[PDB]
Amino acid sequence: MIDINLIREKPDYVKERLATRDKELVSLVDKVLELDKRRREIIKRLEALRSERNKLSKEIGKLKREGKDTTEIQNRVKELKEEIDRLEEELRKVEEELKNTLLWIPNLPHPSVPVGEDEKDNVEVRRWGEPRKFDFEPKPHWEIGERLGILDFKRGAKLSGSRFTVIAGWGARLERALINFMLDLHTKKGYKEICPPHLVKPEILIGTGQLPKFEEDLYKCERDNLYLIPTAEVPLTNLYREEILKEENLPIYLTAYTPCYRREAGAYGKDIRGIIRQHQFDKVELVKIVHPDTSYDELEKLVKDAEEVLQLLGLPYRVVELCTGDLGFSAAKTYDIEVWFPSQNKYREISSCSNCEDFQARRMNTRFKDSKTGKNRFVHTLNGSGLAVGRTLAAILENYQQEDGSVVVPEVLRDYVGTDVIRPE
Amino acid sequence: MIDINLIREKPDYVKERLATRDKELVSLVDKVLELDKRRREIIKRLEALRSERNKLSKEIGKLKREGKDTTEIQNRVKELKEEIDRLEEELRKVEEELKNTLLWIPNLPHPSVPVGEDEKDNVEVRRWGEPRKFDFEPKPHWEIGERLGILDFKRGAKLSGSRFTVIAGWGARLERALINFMLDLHTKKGYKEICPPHLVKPEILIGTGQLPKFEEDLYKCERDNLYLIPTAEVPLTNLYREEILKEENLPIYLTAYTPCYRREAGAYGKDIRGIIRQHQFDKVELVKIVHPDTSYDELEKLVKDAEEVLQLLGLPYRVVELCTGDLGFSAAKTYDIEVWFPSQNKYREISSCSNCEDFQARRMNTRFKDSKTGKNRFVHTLNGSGLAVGRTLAAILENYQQEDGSVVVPEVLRDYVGTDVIRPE
Numbered sequence: 001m002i003d004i005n006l007i008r009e010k011p012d013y014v015k016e017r018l019a020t021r022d023k024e025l026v027s028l029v030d031k032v033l034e035l036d037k038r039r040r041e042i043i044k045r046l047e048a049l050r051s052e053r054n055k056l057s058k059e060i061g062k063l064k065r066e067g068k069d070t071t072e073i074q075n076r077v078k079e080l081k082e083e084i085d086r087l088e089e090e091l092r093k094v095e096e097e098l099k100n101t102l103l104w105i106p107n108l109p110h111p112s113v114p115v116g117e118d119e120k121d122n123v124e125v126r127r128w129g130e131p132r133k134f135d136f137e138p139k140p141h142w143e144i145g146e147r148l149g150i151l152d153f154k155r156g157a158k159l160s161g162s163r164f165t166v167i168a169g170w171g172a173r174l175e176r177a178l179i180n181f182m183l184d185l186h187t188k189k190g191y192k193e194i195c196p197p198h199l200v201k202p203e204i205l206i207g208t209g210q211l212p213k214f215e216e217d218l219y220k221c222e223r224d225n226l227y228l229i230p231t232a233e234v235p236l237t238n239l240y241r242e243e244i245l246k247e248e249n250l251p252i253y254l255t256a257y258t259p260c261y262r263r264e265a266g267a268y269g270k271d272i273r274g275i276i277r278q279h280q281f282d283k284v285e286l287v288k289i290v291h292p293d294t295s296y297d298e299l300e301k302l303v304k305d306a307e308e309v310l311q312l313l314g315l316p317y318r319v320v321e322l323c324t325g326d327l328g329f330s331a332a333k334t335y336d337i338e339v340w341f342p343s344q345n346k347y348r349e350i351s352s353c354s355n356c357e358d359f360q361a362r363r364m365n366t367r368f369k370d371s372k373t374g375k376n377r378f379v380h381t382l383n384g385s386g387l388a389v390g391r392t393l394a395a396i397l398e399n400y401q402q403e404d405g406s407v408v409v410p411e412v413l414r415d416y417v418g419t420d421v422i423r424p425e
Numbered sequence: 426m427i428d429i430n431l432i433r434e435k436p437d438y439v440k441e442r443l444a445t446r447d448k449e450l451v452s453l454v455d456k457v458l459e460l461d462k463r464r465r466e467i468i469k470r471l472e473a474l475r476s477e478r479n480k481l482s483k484e485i486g487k488l489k490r491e492g493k494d495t496t497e498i499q500n501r502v503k504e505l506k507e508e509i510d511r512l513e514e515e516l517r518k519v520e521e522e523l524k525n526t527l528l529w530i531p532n533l534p535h536p537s538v539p540v541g542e543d544e545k546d547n548v549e550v551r552r553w554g555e556p557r558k559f560d561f562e563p564k565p566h567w568e569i570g571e572r573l574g575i576l577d578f579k580r581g582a583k584l585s586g587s588r589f590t591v592i593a594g595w596g597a598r599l600e601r602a603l604i605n606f607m608l609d610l611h612t613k614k615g616y617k618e619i620c621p622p623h624l625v626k627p628e629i630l631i632g633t634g635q636l637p638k639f640e641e642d643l644y645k646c647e648r649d650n651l652y653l654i655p656t657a658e659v660p661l662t663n664l665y666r667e668e669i670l671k672e673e674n675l676p677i678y679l680t681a682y683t684p685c686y687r688r689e690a691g692a693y694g695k696d697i698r699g700i701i702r703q704h705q706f707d708k709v710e711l712v713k714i715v716h717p718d719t720s721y722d723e724l725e726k727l728v729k730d731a732e733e734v735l736q737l738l739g740l741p742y743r744v745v746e747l748c749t750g751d752l753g754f755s756a757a758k759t760y761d762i763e764v765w766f767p768s769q770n771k772y773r774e775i776s777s778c779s780n781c782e783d784f785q786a787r788r789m790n791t792r793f794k795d796s797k798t799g800k801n802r803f804v805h806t807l808n809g810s811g812l813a814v815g816r817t818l819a820a821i822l823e824n825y826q827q828e829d830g831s832v833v834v835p836e837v838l839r840d841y842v843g844t845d846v847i848r849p850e
């Protein structure tokens with residue numbers, strides 16, 4: 001979330017920035033202002049009723065020493081106190097809707113971000129590798145994988161319904177390999193490996209941004225009130241909830257691998273054939289809890305940490321800075337890495353590296369006592385895909401395919417997988 | 426489940442076997458017989474009413490050629506048609522009640538199995554390795570882990586509540602190692618590695634026994650009508666559900682690593698301080714789909730395959746065959762491997778390898794056409810922990826501990842992990 005003061009002090013600005021996301025967001029500012037106003041109004045109106053009653057009860061007490069006024073007044077007091085609670089019971093209720101409304105406002109995009117209405121308005125920032133030229137029509141990742149028997153869409157559906165695929169044999173061995181290759185690379189660079197729970201309490205999702213706006217997007221175990229995580233980002237980032245960190249500890253780099261679970265309730269008809277959009281996918285996250293003054297540079301570093309995976313792998317890609325209209329609830333600025341999919345003759349999202357400044361830190365309450373001022377300051381959070389395993393696999397299957405159908409294992413995964421090429425079973 | 430013929434052909438036997446599990450089961454056998462009877466009666470009476478009807482309808486049709494009998498008979502038909510519905514609509518209710526009843530009876534224990542009411546009447550069948558003796562009081566794994574900063578019980582709770590613990594750094598890097606070491610061993614052995622969905626359709630859990638009896642035990646995602654898996658046994662075994670396999674293919678050996686999710690509604694107050702009983706734990710399962718004749722030999726081999734892990738690891742262990750009173754709903758015979766815990770001064774379940782003969786195969790309908798009789802016969806399924814990664818981690822953290830608190834990396838995992846000993850971070 002964002003600062004209530006920031007809205008009070010500069011509602012103009014907040015509205016122009018939310019406006020770069022969606023003109024329909026401007027209303028959220030008005031509602032919090034209206035809500036905030038009635039809130040401080042009730043406290044003033046009460047501050048009076050409190051004083052009047054206290055004045056009168058004081059006056060019907062000194063009047064105990066004989067007088068009968070204790071009724072035309074003992075009613076102005078009873079009429080009075082019967083409304084202070086009427087209001088107390090609305091301030092309570094007005095502060096509730098204030099708190100919630102605030103949790104529904106997206107992060108204000110950083111000025112450096114280009115303005116746009118949607119994905120078409122994203123800006124390409126750099127490329128790497130030259131997409132392979134084919135002397136034979138290249139095949140889709142789902143075909144090359146079924147024919148090799150390492151992608152069992154049929155059985156996946158038999159067990160879980162659509163958007164579920166069982167990976168098998170070399171297919172699986174390769175998947176694990178990726179995960180291992182990936183983690184080792186990032187840990188060597190300084191990230192703390194960590195295995196987090198996959199089911200999590202609600203606060204956690206409220207902490208990262210997922211809750212409350214995208215609840216229909218998460219699997220929920222209504223019985224235990226725990227949600228399955230849609231990304232390792234959630235558990236990792238909330239690691240230091242309600243804490244005050246030592247500025248010396250900063251920055252905190254941590255990585256992890258986790259199965260990801262998304263109801264994908266929006267993806268209708270889109271990507272219905274391979275493994276690029278599934279209810280369950282493997283992904284190696286990257287998270288950074290840093291000192292405000294280093295956030296944006298850490299962002300740039302993070303994006304490079306991710307590119308490295310792709311280069312080391314020999315998979316051509318390009319980097320895209322997302323425009324305001326495409327940004328994403330928690331992000332203040334973010335780059336997407338897109339890998340080449342021959343079968344589709346286009347680059348496609350394989351990573352999303354973003355900086356959230358204090359947004360997530362605010363709703364999660366993670367601050368630090370700095371070597372200067374001595375006072376508490378909210379930290380900055382960042383996260384990005386240290387390559388979503390599933391999509392990389394698919395990339396691998398397509399960019400390293402052969403006319404006969406086999407797939408050449410990338411030079412750096414061989415030591416992890418076993419073979420150098422996996423031919424038809 | 427078991428066949429109903431077996432029930433009506435030797436109800437005696439059935440009742441005595443279930444009696445070894447619980448004498449309160451004997452009634453189930455009576456309910457299926459009393460229900461099978463009511464059903465066989467309806468089908469016979471129905472086959473009669475159906476003949477009488479077609480006989481008459483044919484009779485009132487050749488009589489349409491001038492005749493008025495089509496009243497006293499066209500009534501004997503309506504009165505008759507009036508009853509066949511009545512019966513079809515109760516046979517249905519009858520048969521529902523009959524098939525769910527059957528889904529509640531446990532597998533018949535194999536004679537070989539020792540009789541007993543409790544886990545204390547389970548008998549030891551062999552050991553391996555001698556429990557290290559200490560010069561100092563050995564410390565429990567949670568104590569050693571928190572000291573090493575590899576087990577964060579506080580944060581696991583902050584994130585997901587009790588019985589949820591985050592593993593970090595060397596802890597995490599070691600756990601991964603474990604999973605790799607184990608899948609490599611088994612894969613080398615001839616098991617097919619597979620990455621299965623963790624979210625599964627109900628029938629699948631009905632497939633391996635988990636449902637209906639243990640619904641309260643599995644996390645359910647009420648909105649999408651899917652369950653979280655409590656073991657890779659589930660998705661792997663159900664892989665060929667509703668299939669007719671080619672005997673040439675048998676046996677089918679497969680392995681996999683997956684997070685296991687258990688509501689552990691029962692585990693109350695027991696194992697409340699480490700990671701031996703958690704709502705989420707890693708486990709490399711081992712599943713076999715074999716030909717009936719080889720079932721029990723495969724079981725023996727399975728336990729050896731599992732044992733192998735613990736030996737290469739240098740972990741003292743003992744094997745025990747579970748008595749009928751402790752068997753486990755779908756098992757027909759089952760051994761548990763229990764590793765040595767210094768801090769507890771006792772051996773503890775770390776593996777559970779069982780044989781289900783045709784029980785599981787019968788409820789998921791997996792069979793095969795054999796090179797002999799040509800007819801279809803249900804397969805035999807087996808499965809067992811190729812080590813519950815979590816409890817193994819705990820075991821090596823205690824058995825390889827040192828005065829100063831560091832823990833010595835077991836010899837075979839150092840090429841996987843990195844260091845040879847992980848000292849206070």
Ligand SMILES: Nc1ncnc2c1ncn2[C@@H]1O[C@H](COS(=O)(=O)NC(=O)[C@@H](N)CO)[C@@H](O)[C@H]1O
Binds near residue numbers: 286388
């Ligand atoms: N349903 C899905 N199936 C497979 N891969 C997916 C799915 N949804 C997203 N991804 C992949 O996962 C990546 C990261 O997801 S993201 O929501 O964009 N970003 C995050 O989750 C951040 N925490 C950074 O990982 C996407 O860029 C894409 O490569």
Ligand SMILES: Nc1ncnc2c1ncn2[C@@H]1O[C@H](COS(=O)(=O)NC(=O)[C@@H](N)CO)[C@@H](O)[C@H]1O
Binds near residue numbers: 711809
């Ligand atoms: N709640 C739990 N937390 C951690 N480990 C557990 C838990 N429950 C069971 N285990 C471990 O997992 C092993 C296998 O589980 S089991 O229920 O006995 N049997 C199975 O899971 C079978 N499906 C074979 O794997 C147990 O022997 C024990 O080592």
